[PDB]
Amino acid sequence: MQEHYQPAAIEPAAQKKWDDARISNVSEDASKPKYYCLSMFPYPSGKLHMGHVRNYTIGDVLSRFKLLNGFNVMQPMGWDAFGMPAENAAMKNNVAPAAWTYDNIEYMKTQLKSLGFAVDWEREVATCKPEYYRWEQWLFTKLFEKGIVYRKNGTVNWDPVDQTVLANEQVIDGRGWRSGALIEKREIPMYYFKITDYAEELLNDLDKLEHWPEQVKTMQRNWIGKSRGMTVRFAVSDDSKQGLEGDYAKFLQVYTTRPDTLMGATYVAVAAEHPLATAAAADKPELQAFIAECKAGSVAEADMATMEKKGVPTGRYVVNPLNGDKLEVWIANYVLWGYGDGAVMAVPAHDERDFEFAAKYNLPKKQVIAVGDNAFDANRWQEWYGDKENGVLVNSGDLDGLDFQTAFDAVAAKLQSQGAGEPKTQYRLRDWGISRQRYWGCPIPIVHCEKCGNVPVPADQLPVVLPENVVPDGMGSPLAKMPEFYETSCPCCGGAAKRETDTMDTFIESSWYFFRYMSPKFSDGMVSAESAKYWGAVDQYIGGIEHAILHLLYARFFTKLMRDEGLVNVDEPFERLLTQGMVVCETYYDWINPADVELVVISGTEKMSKSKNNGVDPQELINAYGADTARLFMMFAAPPEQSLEWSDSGVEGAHRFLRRLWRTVYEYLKQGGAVKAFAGNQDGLSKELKDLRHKLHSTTAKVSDDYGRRQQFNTAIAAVMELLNQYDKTDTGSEQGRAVAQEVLEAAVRLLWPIVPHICETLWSELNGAKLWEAGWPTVDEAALVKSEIEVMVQVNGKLRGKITVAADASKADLEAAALANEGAVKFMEGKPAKKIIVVPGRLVNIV
Ligand SMILES: Nc1ncnc2c1ncn2[C@@H]1O[C@H](COP(=O)(O)OP(=O)(O)OP(=O)(O)O)[C@@H](O)[C@H]1O
Ligand SMILES: Nc1ncnc2c1ncn2[C@@H]1O[C@H](COP(=O)(O)OP(=O)(O)OP(=O)(O)O)[C@@H](O)[C@H]1O
Ligand SMILES: [Mg+2]
Ligand SMILES: [Zn+2]
Description:
By secondary structure, the chain is an alpha+beta fold. The protein has 26 helices and 34 strands. The protein has a domain at 790-847: Ubiquitin-like (UB roll) (Roll). The structure holds adenosine-5'-triphosphate (2 copies), magnesium ion and zinc ion. It is classed as ligase.
């Protein structure tokens, strides 16, 4: 063993040893319990940064822990390769997105290999290969014929100068980002997943996820946005039907989640696109001006809550079906056409939005709910006005005295009897729009034939291959300008036809990649039945909380779709979620990387990302310090969920601890070479050695619980540091001394192998000839945790009457119980009671 830690030498050697042993290349091996640990796969940026290092070290720590415990661990890696960044790089450098992607992939892969992750590279996938995306094309065609995927007109942001559809992210203040021209809203045919059909399942199955963070479930529930409410019809008055056609002539239908307050309705509001708004504005130019100002606004909720709520009265009137009141209709900019009925009732006494609306326009407020003796101020909004759990109805006829749920059900039966309403469930969830007017994505397997309609490509003809010899320009999809791509024959009649030129939402690739990892060379289906049966679901998923919504929702949706097609047999893809805090670092700029700088403006610490260029290249850190220093620093600097600050001092600390670990083992074996680790009965060991073994086996139980239950790796490292501290203060020079030292060192390097496997692998080989992964995770010797018994003097009225042997963990009540039963106290207390029993732990007990 060389004297000095040399990571540049030992880290490649260790990586080659694990590779030749194929410990990370796994099969569906029934002889071993499976563990599937997945980290969210990366987009091929070109270069990884410390955030990716942190995410993937965390996944590798968990994988290696389960490995050492005997599990058949699958930890796969791959590339989320489709999307816009490659298209922007293509426009900049005049290269094909495919070429730019594969070059970024090869570089990032070597970056990952040099960090020493225990990754099954034989299961590697790149989502832009036809071998991958043919299967989401396949599932598209299968769902299309079931109607679960359908084609429908939807609205998009059209830029009339760049001649391209824009996302909302690139429409700033109503104009194009790179053009500034005023955007048109156009309706074009597009494809959708009918995800609303699965809303109840996506909501209820969250209860099955007993090991998910509660907030992630809460975010999923809020996004789906289920509500149980009431459809309520208000009859149109006799005088207010002019211009109304159809059902809109007879009643105004609204949706409310507070039907218990229907007696308190004072006005009603419709969306600017509602038929009643259109009829009233026929001769009112102010209503036309208002309608037009609403239609020229974002229904985006990011602007809806921060929007000033405005309305104008229509002069039209409807009748409340419960109390008979005639209420005026208002047009309001907050009523969204498309959600529910596009019309609402307003109860300003018990809904905050309605309260502010009615205050501005002096519209009436009628109290119908009371919470105790709380006083109702028509001019001041109190938070209990909207209390739904502790309230009771008021001014509501025969509904007086009921609580929310009882009133809800009474209104339900009342309205159904009068035919003016019924219970209804709504969801904020909309269907999932699939179509993108972009080149670098999965082609949509549809053919358009003027005879047969829009026809899916037969499975025998899949994939529809995306041509890779293409350099996008920024002025529209190249696919729609490539007749050699879109000109085809119809698969149903054989006539001349046109391929769909839109591509798929790149969320689709990451919605099932975790199943493809189970059998990524399988060419007869998305995933083989045998491999899906063996691997089941993902045991552990590690990735940022920013994806806790759409990505997770889509992945759970696809899981259920694939289950329904009989491809997998689980309801949920991810059993546990770990979402790691972001790594942050200072900024400089005109955005500059901090590596390029020496101690440009020096702005404020902020998350590492490509947008402000503050991403620190791990390759610089590995060249300077080694992979193990990188991994240790990230695992030690903070709990995984907490944010991590880049610190060169933190790197220096990690490296010097690795030297301390090296120095310890080398010094130990300089002083006499390897011996058999201490094992077995420890009676007869010196107090100092018994205490080091107590520290050792306490450290083992603590590290095991921090890896396996708490997932807090910083404290696990601190515990092993305390073990080494006690080791350093223990004389291990004797023959039993050396045996315990060997046992300590053999445990320490196994305990840290998940964090820093390169140094631990090399150190282990110098301590012990067995294979580290066969010796397995260190076990707890519980005999080593029993401290020694004490002798306690039993006194009666002060005079010593007996002695007792109690444990070193015995409470003051064990001492008191043991003292009263000692045969010396019994025959000197004279059957009298104890007026007081003074207990001094470890010394004596005295009964008074
Ligand atoms: N098209 C619409 N545009 C705007 N508001 C609407 C629309 N349809 C219904 N509403 C109003 O939204 C209210 C609540 O609907 P929503 O789906 O937001 O439930 P919620 O936020 O869970 O309810 P709550 O306010 O009790 O917490 C209904 O009472 C109704 O007054
Ligand atoms: N600064 C950071 N600190 C910690 N983890 C990070 C950081 N930046 C990214 N990650 C994590 O690294 C993983 C890769 O994220 P990234 O945004 O690069 O790609 P992605 O998940 O494929 O999505 P997209 O296609 O939008 O880029 C995620 O789990 C993310 O949470
Ligand atoms: Mg369960
Ligand atoms: Zn045809």
